[PDB]
Coordinates of C-alpha atoms and ligand atoms in Angstrom, one line a residue:
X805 CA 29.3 140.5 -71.4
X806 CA 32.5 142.4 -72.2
X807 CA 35.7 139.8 -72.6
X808 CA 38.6 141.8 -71.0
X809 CA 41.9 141.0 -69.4
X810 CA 43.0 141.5 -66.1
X811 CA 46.4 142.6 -66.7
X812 CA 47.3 145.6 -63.3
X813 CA 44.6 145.0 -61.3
X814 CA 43.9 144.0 -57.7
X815 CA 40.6 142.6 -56.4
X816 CA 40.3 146.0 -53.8
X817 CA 41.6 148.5 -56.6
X818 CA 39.0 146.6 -59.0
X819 CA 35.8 147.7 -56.3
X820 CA 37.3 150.9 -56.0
X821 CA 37.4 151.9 -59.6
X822 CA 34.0 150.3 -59.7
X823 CA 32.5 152.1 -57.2
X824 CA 31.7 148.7 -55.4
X825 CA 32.3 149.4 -51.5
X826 CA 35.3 147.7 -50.2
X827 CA 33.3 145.7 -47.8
X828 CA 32.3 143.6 -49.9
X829 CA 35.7 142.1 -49.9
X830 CA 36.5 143.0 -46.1
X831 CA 33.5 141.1 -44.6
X832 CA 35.0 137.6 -46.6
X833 CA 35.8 134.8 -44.3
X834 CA 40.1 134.4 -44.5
X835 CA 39.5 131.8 -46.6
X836 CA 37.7 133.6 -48.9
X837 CA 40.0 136.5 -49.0
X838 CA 43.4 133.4 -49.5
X839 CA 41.3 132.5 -52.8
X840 CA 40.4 136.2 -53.5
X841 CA 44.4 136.6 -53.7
X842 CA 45.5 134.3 -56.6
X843 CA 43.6 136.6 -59.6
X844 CA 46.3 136.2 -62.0
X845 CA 47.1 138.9 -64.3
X846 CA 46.8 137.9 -68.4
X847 CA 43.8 136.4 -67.4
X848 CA 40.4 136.8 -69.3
X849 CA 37.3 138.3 -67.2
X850 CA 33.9 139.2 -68.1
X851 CA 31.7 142.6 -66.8
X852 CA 28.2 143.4 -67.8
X853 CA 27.4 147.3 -67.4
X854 CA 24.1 149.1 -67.5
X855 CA 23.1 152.4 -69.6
X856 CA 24.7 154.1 -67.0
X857 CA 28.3 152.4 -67.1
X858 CA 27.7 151.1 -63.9
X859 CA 29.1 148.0 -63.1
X860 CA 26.2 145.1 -62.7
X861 CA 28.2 142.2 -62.8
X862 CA 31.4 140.5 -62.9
X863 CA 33.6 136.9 -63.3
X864 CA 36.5 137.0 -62.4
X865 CA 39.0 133.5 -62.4
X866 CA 40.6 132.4 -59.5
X867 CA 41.6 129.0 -61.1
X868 CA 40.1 127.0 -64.1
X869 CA 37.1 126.0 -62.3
X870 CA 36.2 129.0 -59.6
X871 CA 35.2 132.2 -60.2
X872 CA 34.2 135.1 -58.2
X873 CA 31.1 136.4 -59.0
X874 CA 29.9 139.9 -58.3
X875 CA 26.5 141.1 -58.6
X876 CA 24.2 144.1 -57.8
X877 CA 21.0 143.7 -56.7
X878 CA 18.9 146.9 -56.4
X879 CA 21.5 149.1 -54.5
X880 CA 23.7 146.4 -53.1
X881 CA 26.8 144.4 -54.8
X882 CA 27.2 140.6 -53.4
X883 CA 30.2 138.8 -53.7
X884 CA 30.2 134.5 -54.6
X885 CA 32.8 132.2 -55.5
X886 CA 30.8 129.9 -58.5
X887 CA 31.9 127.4 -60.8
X888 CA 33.4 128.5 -64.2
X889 CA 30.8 127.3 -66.8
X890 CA 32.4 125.7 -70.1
X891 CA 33.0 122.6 -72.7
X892 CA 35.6 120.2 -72.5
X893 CA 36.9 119.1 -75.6
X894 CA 39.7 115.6 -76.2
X895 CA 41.8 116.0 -79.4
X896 CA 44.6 113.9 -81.0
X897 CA 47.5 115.8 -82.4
X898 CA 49.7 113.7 -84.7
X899 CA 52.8 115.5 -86.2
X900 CA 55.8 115.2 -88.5
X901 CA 58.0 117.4 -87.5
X902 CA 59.1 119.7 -90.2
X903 CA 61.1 122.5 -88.5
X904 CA 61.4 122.9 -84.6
X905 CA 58.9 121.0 -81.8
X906 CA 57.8 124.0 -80.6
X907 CA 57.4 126.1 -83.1
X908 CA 55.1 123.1 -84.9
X909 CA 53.2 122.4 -82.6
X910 CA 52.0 125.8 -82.7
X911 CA 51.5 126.1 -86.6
X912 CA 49.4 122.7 -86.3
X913 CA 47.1 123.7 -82.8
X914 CA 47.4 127.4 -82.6
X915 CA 48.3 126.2 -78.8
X916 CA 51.3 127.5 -77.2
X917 CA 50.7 126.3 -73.9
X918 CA 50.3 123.4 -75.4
X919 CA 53.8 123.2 -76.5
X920 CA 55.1 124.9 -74.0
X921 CA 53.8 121.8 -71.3
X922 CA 54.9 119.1 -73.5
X923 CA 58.8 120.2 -73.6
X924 CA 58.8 120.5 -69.8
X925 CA 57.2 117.3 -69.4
X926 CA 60.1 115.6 -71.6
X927 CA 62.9 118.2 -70.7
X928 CA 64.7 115.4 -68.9
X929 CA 64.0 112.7 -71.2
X930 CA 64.1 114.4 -74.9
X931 CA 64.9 118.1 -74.9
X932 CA 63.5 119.1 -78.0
X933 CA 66.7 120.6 -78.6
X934 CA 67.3 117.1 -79.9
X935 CA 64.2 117.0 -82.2
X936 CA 64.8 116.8 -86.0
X937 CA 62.8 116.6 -89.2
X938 CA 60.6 114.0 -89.5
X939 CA 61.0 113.1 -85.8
X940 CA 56.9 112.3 -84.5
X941 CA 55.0 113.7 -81.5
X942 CA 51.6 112.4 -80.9
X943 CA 49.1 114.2 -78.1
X944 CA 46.4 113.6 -76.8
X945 CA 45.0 116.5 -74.5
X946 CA 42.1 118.2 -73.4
X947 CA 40.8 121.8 -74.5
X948 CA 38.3 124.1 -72.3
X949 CA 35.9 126.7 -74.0
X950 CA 33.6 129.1 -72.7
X951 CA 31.1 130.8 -75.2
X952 CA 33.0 129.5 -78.1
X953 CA 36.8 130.9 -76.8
X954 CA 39.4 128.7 -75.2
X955 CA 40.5 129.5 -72.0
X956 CA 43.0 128.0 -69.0
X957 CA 45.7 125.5 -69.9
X958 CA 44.9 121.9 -71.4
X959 CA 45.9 118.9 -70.1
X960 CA 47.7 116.4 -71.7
X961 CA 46.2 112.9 -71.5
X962 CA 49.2 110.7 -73.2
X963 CA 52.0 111.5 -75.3
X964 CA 54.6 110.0 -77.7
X965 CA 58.0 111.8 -79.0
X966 CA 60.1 109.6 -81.3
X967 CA 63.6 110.6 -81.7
X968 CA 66.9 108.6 -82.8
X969 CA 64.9 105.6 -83.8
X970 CA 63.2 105.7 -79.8
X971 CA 59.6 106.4 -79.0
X972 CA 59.2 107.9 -75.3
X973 CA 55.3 107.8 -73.9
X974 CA 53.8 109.6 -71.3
X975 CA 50.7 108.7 -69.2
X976 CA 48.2 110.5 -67.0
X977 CA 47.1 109.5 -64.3
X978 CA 44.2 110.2 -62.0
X979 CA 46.8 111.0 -59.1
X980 CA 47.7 114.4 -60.7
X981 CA 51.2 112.7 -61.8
X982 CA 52.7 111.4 -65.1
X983 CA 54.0 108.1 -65.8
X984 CA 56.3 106.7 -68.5
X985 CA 55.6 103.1 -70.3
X986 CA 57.0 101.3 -67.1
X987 CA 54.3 103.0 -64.9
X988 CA 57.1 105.1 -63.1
X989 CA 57.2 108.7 -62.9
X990 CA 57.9 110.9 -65.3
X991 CA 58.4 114.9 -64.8
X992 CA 57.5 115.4 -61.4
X993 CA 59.6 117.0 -58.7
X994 CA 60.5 116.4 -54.8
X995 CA 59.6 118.9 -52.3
X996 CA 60.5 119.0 -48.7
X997 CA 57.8 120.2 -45.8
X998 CA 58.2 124.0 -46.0
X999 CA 57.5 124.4 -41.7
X1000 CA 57.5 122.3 -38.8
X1001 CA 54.0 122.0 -38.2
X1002 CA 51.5 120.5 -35.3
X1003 CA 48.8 119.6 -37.7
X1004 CA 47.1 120.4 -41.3
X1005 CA 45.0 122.6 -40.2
X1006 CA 43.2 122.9 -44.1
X1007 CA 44.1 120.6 -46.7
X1008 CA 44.2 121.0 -50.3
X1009 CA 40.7 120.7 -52.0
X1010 CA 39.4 120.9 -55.5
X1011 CA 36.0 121.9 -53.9
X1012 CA 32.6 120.4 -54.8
X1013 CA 30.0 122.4 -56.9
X1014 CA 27.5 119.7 -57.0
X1015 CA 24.8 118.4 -56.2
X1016 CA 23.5 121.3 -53.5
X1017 CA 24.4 119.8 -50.2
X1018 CA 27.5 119.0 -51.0
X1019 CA 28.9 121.7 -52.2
X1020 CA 32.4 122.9 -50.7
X1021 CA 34.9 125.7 -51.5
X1022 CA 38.1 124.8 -53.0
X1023 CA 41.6 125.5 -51.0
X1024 CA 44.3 125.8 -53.3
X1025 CA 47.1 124.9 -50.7
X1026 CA 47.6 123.5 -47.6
X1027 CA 47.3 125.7 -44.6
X1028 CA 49.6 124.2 -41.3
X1029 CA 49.3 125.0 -37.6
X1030 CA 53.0 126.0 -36.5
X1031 CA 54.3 127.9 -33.4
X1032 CA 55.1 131.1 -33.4
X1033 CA 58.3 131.6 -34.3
X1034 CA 58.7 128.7 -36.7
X1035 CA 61.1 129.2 -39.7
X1036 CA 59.9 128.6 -42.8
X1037 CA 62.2 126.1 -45.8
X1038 CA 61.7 126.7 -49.4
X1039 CA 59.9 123.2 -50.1
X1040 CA 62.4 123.4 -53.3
X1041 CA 65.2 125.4 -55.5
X1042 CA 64.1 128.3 -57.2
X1043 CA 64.3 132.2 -57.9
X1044 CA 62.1 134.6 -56.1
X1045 CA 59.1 136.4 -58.3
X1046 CA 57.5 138.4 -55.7
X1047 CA 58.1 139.1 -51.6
X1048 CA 55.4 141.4 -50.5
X1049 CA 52.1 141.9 -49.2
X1050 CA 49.1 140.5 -50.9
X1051 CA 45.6 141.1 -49.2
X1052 CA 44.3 137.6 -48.3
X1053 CA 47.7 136.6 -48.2
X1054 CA 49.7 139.0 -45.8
X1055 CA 52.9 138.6 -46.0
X1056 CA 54.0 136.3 -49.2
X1057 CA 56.7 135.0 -51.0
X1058 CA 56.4 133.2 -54.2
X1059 CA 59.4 131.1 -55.8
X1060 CA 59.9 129.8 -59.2
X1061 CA 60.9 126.7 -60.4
X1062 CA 60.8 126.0 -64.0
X1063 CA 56.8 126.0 -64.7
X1064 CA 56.2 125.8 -60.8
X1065 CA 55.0 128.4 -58.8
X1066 CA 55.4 128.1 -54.6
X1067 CA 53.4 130.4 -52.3
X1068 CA 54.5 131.0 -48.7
X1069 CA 51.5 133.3 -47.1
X1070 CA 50.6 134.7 -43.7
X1071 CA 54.1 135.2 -43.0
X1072 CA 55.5 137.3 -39.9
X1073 CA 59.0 138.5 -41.9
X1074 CA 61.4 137.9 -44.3
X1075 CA 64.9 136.6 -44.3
X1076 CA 67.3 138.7 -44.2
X1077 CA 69.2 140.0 -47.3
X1078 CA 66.0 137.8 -49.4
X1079 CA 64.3 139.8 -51.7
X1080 CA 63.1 140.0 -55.5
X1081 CA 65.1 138.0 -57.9
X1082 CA 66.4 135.8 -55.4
X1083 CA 67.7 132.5 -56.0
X1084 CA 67.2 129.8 -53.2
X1085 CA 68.1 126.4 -52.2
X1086 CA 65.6 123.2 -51.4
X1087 CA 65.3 124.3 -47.6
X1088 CA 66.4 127.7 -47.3
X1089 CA 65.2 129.6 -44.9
X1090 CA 63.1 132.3 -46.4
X1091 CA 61.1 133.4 -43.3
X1092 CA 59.0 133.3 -40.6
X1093 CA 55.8 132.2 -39.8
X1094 CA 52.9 134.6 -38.9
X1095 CA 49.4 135.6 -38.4
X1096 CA 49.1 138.3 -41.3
X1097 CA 46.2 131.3 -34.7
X1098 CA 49.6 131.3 -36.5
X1099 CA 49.2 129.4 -40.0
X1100 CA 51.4 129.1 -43.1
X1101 CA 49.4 129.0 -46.3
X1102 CA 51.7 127.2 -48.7
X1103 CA 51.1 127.0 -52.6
X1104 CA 52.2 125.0 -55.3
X1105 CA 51.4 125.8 -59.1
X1106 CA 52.6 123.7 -62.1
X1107 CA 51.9 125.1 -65.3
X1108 CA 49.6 127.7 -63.4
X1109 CA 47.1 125.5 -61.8
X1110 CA 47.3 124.6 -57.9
X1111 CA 47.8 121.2 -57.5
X1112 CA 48.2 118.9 -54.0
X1113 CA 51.3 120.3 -52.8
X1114 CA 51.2 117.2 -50.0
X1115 CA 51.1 114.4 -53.2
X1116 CA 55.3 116.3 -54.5
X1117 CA 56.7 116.3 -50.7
X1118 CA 58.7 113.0 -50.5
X1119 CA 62.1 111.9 -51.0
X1120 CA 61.6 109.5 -54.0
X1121 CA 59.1 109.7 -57.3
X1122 CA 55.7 108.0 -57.8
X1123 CA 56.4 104.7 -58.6
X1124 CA 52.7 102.2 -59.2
X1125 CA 52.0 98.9 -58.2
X1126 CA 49.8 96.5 -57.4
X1127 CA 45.9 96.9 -59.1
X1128 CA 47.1 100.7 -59.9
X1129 CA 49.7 99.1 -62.0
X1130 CA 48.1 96.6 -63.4
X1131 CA 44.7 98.6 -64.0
X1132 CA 47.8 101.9 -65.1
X1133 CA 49.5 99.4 -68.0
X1134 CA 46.4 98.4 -69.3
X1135 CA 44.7 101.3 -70.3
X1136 CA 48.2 102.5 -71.7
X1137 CA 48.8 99.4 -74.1
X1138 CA 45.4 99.9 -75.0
X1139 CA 46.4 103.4 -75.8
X1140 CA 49.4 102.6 -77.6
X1141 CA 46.9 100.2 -79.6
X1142 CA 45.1 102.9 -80.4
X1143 CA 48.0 105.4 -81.6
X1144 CA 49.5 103.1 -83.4
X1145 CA 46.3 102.5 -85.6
X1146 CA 45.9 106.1 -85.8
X1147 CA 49.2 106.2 -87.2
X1148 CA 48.6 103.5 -89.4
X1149 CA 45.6 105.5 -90.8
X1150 CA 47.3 109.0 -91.1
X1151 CA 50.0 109.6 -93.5
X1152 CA 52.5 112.3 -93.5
X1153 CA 53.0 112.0 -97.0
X1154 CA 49.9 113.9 -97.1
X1155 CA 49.8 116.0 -94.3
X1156 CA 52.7 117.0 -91.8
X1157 CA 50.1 117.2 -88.9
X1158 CA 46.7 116.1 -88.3
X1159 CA 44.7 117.7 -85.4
X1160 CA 41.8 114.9 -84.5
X1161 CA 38.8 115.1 -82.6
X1162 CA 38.6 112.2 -79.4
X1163 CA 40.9 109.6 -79.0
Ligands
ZN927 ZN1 45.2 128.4 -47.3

């Protein structure tokens, strides 16, 4: 296949200059055409052509793990939503800082996301505006490849920054959130319940690819049942990226908050005097709810990947206990165990950065 990037594109203008009838995204169930709406530009797709130039297939990412796939057989093009096939690779990154976090980070992994995650997840903790040389940052993390190239974002598994004689850890967790040594959150975010709603009427969902029978599409937000009418709250602070029309979406606003993305969709109007470059307020009204039954499709993206939106609405952070604590501090001493002999083992006299495989 050819490796691309999406960069202008829509989904429609995609069949179009294709040649692919526009049906083929018209006939999609809604939810279908709500997943068909978060292509994200920058992204890398793949298109297989015949002699002719036509078009005989495509993959296109809605999210790390789905794809749409588009296909002709004989004269007609079909449409899927598949799981993106690839390799899942731990590493260990132990630096010595020798100029600037960021900047290092890249020069030892070639990973700017990568960097780019770990000074959010400490902004409030260590700004790496405070790093200096010779401060360390450990990582653990996991890296995707398809066919050999990395793709998507990895995911940090545990951290360590030491600074001014401190070292600050942070911890995964199969919840989606990040927890410091203590087991309390770390990095996370309060959001407030963007409508007044009569029910979830779709929760969130990773979707199941396996095995046959249980296989389910993903939703990558939560759609509510509200009246008519209702007014919709920004769930948090932010500025405004886009207010528009989106096809699958209607109606749409998207807000952003630091590396967080919120989605608004199917919505009946704007507020007034709202538009592009925007800045709003935790529960600002930024609209009203619509049918482009009535239904809000609400979003939330942190470091471009849809997460749980319901898991960040509360008034107070993640705090564990019980089993989940004890089970949590655990497996994060034995981490620290396990750092610490790494450590032990790899001297910056030598090298200012090792980049290990596993953990
Ligand atoms: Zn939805």
């Amino acid at each position: 296949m050819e490796r691309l990037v999406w960069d202008k594109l829509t989904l429609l203008g995609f069949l179009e200059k294709n040649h692919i009838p526009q049906k083929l995204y018209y006939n999609l169930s809604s939810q279908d055409k709500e997943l068909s709406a978060e292509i994200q530009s920058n992204v890398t797709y793949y298109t297989l052509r015949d002699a002719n130039n036509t078009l005989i297939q495509a993959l296109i990412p809605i999210s790390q793990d789905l794809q749409i796939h588009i296909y002709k057989k004989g004269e007609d093009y079909f449409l899927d939503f598949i799981p993106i096939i690839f390799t899942r690779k731990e590493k260990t990154l132990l630096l010595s800082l020798q100029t600037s976090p960021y900047q290092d980070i890249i020069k030892a992994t070639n990973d700017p996301l990568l960097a780019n995650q770990l000074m959010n997840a400490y902004k409030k903790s260590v700004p790496f505006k405070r790093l200096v040389k010779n401060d360390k940052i450990a990582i653990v993390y996991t890296r995707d490849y398809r066919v050999g190239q990395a793709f998507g974002q990895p995911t940090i598994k545990m951290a360590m920054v030491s600074s001014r004689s401190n070292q600050y850890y942070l911890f995964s967790h199969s919840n989606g959130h990040y927890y410091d040594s203590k087991a309390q959150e770390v990095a996370g975010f309060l959001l407030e319940t963007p409508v007044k709603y009569t029910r979830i009427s779709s929760p969130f969902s990773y979707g199941r690819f396996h095995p046959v029978l249980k296989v389910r599409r993903p939703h990558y937000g939560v759609d509510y049942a509200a009246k008519h009418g209702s007014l919709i709250h920004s769930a948090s602070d932010g500025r405004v990226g886009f207010m528009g029309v989106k096809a699958g979406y209607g109606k749409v606003v998207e807000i952003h908050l630091n590396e967080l993305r919120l989605v608004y969709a199917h919505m009946s109007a704007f507020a007034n005097g709202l538009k592009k470059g925007s800045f709003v307020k935790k529960g600002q009204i930024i609209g009203r709810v619509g049918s482009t039954g009535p239904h809000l499709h609400f979003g939330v993206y942190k470091n471009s990947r849809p997460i749980n939106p319901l898991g960040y609405i509360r008034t107070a952070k993640s705090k564990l206990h019980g089993k989940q604590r004890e089970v949590f501090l655990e497996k994060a001493q034995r981490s620290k165990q396990k750092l610490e002999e790494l450590l032990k083992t790899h001297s910056f006299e030598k090298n200012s950065f090792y980049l290990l495989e596993g953990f």
